[PDB]
Write a protein that binds this ligand. Structure first.
Ligand SMILES: C[C@H](CCO)N(C)C(=O)CCCN1c2ccccc2N(Cc2ccc(C(O)(C(F)(F)F)C(F)(F)F)cc2)S1(=O)=O
Ligand code: NA
Length: 254
């Protein structure tokens, strides 16, 4: 691939992300003063564990649906075989969400945009997974220190998804070629914008993998306590990705 092709890939990736970003960045910023009162925080802490898990699983499922659309609009993704499309989304969708979440994180007060207002870590105490929540808040805090532009988030999350090392890929070489083109696009954009210094500050890949593992572990603990809640009230796309059909139809329906 030549230079003009790399720059066209940069614009293509940034456009696909803008169309699928779900929450507009300026909308997230304009709401930073809108914070839950102590009474509203107490209301969240008084909710039952299973109610809070269901609500968070619903919110996560909705965000994942936008990551699926990002993948479908991503250059070269729909060219891969269906097995590899599903392998990449199963391993990478949650990792993309984890990176995207930093846009709704306010590092000044350590609050996140959740259900219409900003609140701190204590909002989620009823989940009974404080270590996982604290890890996600720290991860978003680390990403916030990099001051990602929207274009940088686009290119970085494309690479999080297009990972040729995922186990189960049938056409590993094809994914390797697409990953390399995306890496050139990412690094070309950082060089042109004088932002190559962020490369050494990006999180290790085992970090994203560690957070997803924690998520699956806490889910299996909750599912053991409330199996009927998961069966009856968790989104089916959520169960397909994280518990132990939907992705196929999302990819086919376009
Ligand atoms: C990615 C998407 C659009 C891109 O801009 N976006 C901004 C959002 O969806 C908003 C999420 C904002 N939140 C956030 C951002 C930073 C750090 C923490 C948090 N939240 C706490 C939280 C809740 C729930 C969970 C869980 O659901 C999971 F699965 F994600 F870990 C769990 F509790 F079940 F574990 C894990 C942390 S949060 O309130 O969900
Ligand atoms: Na941020």
């Amino acid at each position: 691939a030549s230079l003009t092709e790399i720059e066209h890939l940069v614009q293509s990736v940034c456009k696909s992300y803008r169309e699928t970003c779900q929450l507009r960045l300026e909308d997230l910023l304009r709401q930073r003063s809108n914070i839950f009162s102590r009474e509203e925080v107490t209301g969240y802490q008084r909710k039952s564990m299973w109610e809070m898990w269901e609500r968070c699983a619903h919110h996560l499922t909705e965000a994942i649906q936008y990551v699926v659309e990002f993948a479908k609009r991503l250059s070269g993704f729909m060219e891969l075989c269906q097995n590899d499309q599903i392998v990449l989304l199963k391993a990478g969708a949650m990792e993309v969400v984890l990176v995207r979440m930093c846009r709704a994180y306010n590092a000044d007060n350590r609050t996140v945009f959740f259900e219409g207002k900003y609140g701190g870590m204590e909002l989620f105490r009823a989940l009974g997974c404080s270590e996982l929540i604290s890890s996600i808040f720290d991860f978003s805090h680390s990403l916030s220190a990099l001051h990602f532009s929207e274009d940088e988030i686009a290119l970085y999350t494309a690479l999080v998804l297009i990972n040729a090392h995922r186990p189960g890929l049938q056409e590993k070489r094809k994914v390797e070629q697409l990953q390399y083109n995306l890496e050139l696009a990412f690094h070309h954009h950082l060089c042109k914008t004088h932002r190559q210094s962020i490369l050494a500050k990006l999180p290790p890949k085992g970090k994203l993998r560690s957070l997803c593992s924690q998520h699956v572990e806490r889910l299996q603990i909750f599912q053991h306590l409330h199996p009927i809640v998961v069966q009856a009230a968790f989104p089916p796309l959520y169960k397909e990705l994280f518990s132990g059909k939907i992705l196929h139809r999302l990819l086919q329906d376009s």
